[PDB]
Amino acid sequence: AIENSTSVSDHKVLDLIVLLLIHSTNSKNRKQTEKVLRSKIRLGCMPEQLMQNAFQNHSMVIKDFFPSILSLAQTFLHSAHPAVVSFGSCMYKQAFAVFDSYCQQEVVCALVTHVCSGNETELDISLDVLTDLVILHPSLLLRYATFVKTILDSMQKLNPCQIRKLFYILSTLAFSQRQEGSYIQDDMHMVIRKWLSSSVPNHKQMGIIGAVTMMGSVALIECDGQLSTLLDLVGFCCEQTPEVLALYYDELANLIEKQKGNLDLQLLDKFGKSLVEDFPNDFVVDLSPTVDGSFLFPVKSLYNLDEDETQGAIAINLLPLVSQKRVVSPICLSPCFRLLRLYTGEQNNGSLEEIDALLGCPLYLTDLEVEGKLDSLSKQEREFLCSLLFYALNWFREVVNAFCQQQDAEMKGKVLTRLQNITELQNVLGKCLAATPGYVPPPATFDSEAPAQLQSYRPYFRELDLEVFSVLHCGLLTLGPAELCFLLDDMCWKLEHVLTFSHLCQRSPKEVAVCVVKLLKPLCNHMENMHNYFQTVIPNQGVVDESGLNIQEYQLMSSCYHQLLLAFRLLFAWSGFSQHENSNLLRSALQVLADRLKPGETEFLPLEELISESFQYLLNFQASIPSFQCAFILTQVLMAISEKPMTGWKREKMASLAKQFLCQSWMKPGGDREKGSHFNSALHTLLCVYLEHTDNILKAIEEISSVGVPELINSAKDGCSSTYPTLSRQTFPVFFRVMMAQLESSVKSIPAGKPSDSGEVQLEKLLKWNIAVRNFHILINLVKVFDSRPVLSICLKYGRLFVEAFLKLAMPLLDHSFKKHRDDVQSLLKTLQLSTRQLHHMCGHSKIHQDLGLTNHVPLLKKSLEQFVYRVKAML
């Protein structure tokens, strides 16, 4: 009787207390207790604010509920369905807060054992101990002296990006305890000195991550002396040749990026001035860069000095270090440029004329020709010559694009010109990489991050996620189709991991949302309105019909709109905004309502901004002519904006979903564009059209069936979602057959006993469902004579489900046998009985290629239905 409450569930803390009580005491009740509690967490009504009311108002009453229900539930509530995991995390985060010392030690050890074994949980754990370190800092180091230290002895288990959070933990405890803390972690990362030396193929990586992390905790003496000695080994591994110098560079860059307002100039200047100033004198001290010198393997001795020309000197200009090259780009290049651009932004502070301090790289960009980086014409392998030189080129230019993004209206254009030249360089580079047999994997898929290949050419893609780069370049035209393509692809491939890559995941997903959906809503909506204009023109449809002059511009202007709508989904379609802290949901929604639809509804109350913005979005949808690979997202976005289908306008949404399934951008102008993208797109849009269609799925599914009748004759009309000559592989069928078995299982309260004709109108509904089952099963054999590869295997599960639903509903055949009106109960129960039998005899001869064994195994299952029909015929 705690489940059937919906008015007190948000105010009955005294329901949570009792639920923990019953779980703590009653042993056999506990598995049902967890179930009712979980199902009350989902479907709202049980927020983490109720749990704070329990912990922080009734602590002494709930203190008895602990290592039984409380810790065990909280561990057991880290499974899935992330409405409940922000509850399970609040249980650990408040049990540490209000309880006593044994309970604090036990929650700490619960988190630690939880991170020392676990696959998806370790994220929630590491963010949890992170919240514990940032929130209750002196109260955690007591419960840490061997407990949080432990997981370092299992860092090899899993920490791709969790290692930076883990050493954030250990460092924050080290710096918040002058009496004991700092020596502990300095000993940890010092034992990592032998690790830094050679203790594995790894453990030097982890060495410098830990070293810079403990080294930035000193940035906000005896600690200075302990620091410098364990820094000299970092310098030595840096002085050792490889990329382990570049990782030291990258780590110092990440430290400046993460803590910006703190970390005064003198401390970091003492840290790096010998690492910054190693760039503009790695090779560029010359005078006339038009000469080649040797520029070893000189393919670009004949064409040096690529196009920037916005400088007053040319010494080597990024060429000569790139000559011999074989660099991991700490050599006056990308990982070193990331520290140059950040020490230039912290030292010579203000960062405004400090971008103007480095008005080129070191006040130089490049010159006025095409090429200008030399690593071929002696490297006889066609791949490792330019496909490792142009990777460094693109990483260079997009470090320059991710670096200089301030409001310098002379540098803003050049940065847009830099993104443009990066697009053309990326095109030539991708052409060279494709023409390369294999690829230069090393500085594409192994360097530039560990120190569209997309994985390791990491800084070559607006850091592959850099949220401030899209702020400028997408807020710029608030200028280029293929530039909008690349910047939007970065936006989407970052919003995937972040909001549902070690420099985006250095911000919490709410902060990535606040900087993406909030502070970049209008810059994206304006380009979406411009694309809506270019679709009511012939820029998206001209190269199919009329404007056959830029064929390869329509594709890019389509992919831009597609990535824009996937951005519109992934910003809204995820938990990254739509949880109980929903003020940001309003700040994100009001900008969509007032985007072009009457900006006077700013202070409009909740559930009206959603209903307003949905009208403008659905008004846009009628021109979504991108060949509807994005219309499968133009429904997935709008469905994700509104809460559930309960809106009256959602009926027009579903009625427009049928218009889309009839259209798919008006019969999907490609003849092969339906193959593999649409093989999931149509199969998910059909689930929307059949999840709601004028509230009558039975008339709807029958309309699709009698539409599939026309799918045989001449193979295409009345719905292009399944109008391919091979029936679009009958994926509309596989969805329609999952729909009928759902409709039959749905009609269970329709047969309400056998009281009256109200209980007898359900017989007509089960009869119409059997009529639709017969119509589908009749075309099942007719289309199976065309083809039955997976269609047969789908029809087997369909027959197994529909007959099981008929057995579930046979209670209204035998109980409603006198309500079947025995003077007319022959044809009444005869319809379903003869239909199921004729279909089951039609259900045999396909799935039988098992050495003549399954020719009647389907009839062997059908004998159960025939026996039930015999019992019902004797019953009626």
Added chain:
Amino acid sequence: LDGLLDSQDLVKKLMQMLSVSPVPIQHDIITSLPEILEDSQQNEVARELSCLLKQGRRLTVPILDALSRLDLDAELLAKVRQSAMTIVPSVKLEDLPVVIKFILHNVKAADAVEVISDLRKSLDLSSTSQNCVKLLFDVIKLAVRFQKDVSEAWIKAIENSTSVSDHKVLDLIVLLLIHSTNSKNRKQTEKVLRSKIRLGCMPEQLMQNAFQNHSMVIKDFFPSILSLAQTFLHSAHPAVVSFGSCMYKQAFAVFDSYCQQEVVCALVTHVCSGNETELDISLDVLTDLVILHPSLLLRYATFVKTILDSMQKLNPCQIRKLFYILSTLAFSQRQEGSYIQ
């Protein structure tokens, strides 16, 4: 990365030369003194001290020294641990957890069912058990509970024991520890515990020692395993029911007031719903009233009074024991008791 190549060898030679004055001073320094060469990191002192290890003071050195070890000196780490397994009866409670931690980290992720087996077999030389020894080995096994792979290893290697099981107080505690901590590893924990109760070798005298002389270590495992097993050990096979009765007939005796109130309520709910259990419960509260009489009426003022309101359920001969309970608490308290009943 300075290669002081002969500055570990002459150092160790002169350190094994003079006397016992700077023994620990020259000893502890050799971790960062042999740290010059990456090849001499895990291989130079891999045998230069693996045989010189005769006392306890050299233990921290090889732990940090075997830095790479090619996953083979870790076998030699368990081997030098087997060498120190004899020093475990020779160190004499000086570096007990300081030694056992070296062995317990040595088999980290691989098969360790023989590692824990050799550990408990060496524990026959140290822990019936010594006075500090319970918390001593607990300061290693509790702190090794985290890895979640030597938990199940010690479970699957606690069954194959038949020589130490009667003196396995320090292997009684581990079953309660694994059950209280490891959630999915709890149903197998009850199974191995039950099957060790049956077939002898686990008497109520073991639980009595593990509750009386060694209690602050097990008092942490009360709110789960101990009460949640004793309620679940009242099912059948009455070799184990005289064990589950000792579990919460001794929990009332040594634990703190919350545990006493919770055992009394466990018995009271147990007799307020139960078919054959109610006999064991009623004799159990009977034992509590005859044994700890003034310590039960405090935990009784509404708790033992309750079952009068369900006497209609079942008490053919239990009603006489029930009113024996209530009458004994009545007559054992002149201040409040007699008025109550």
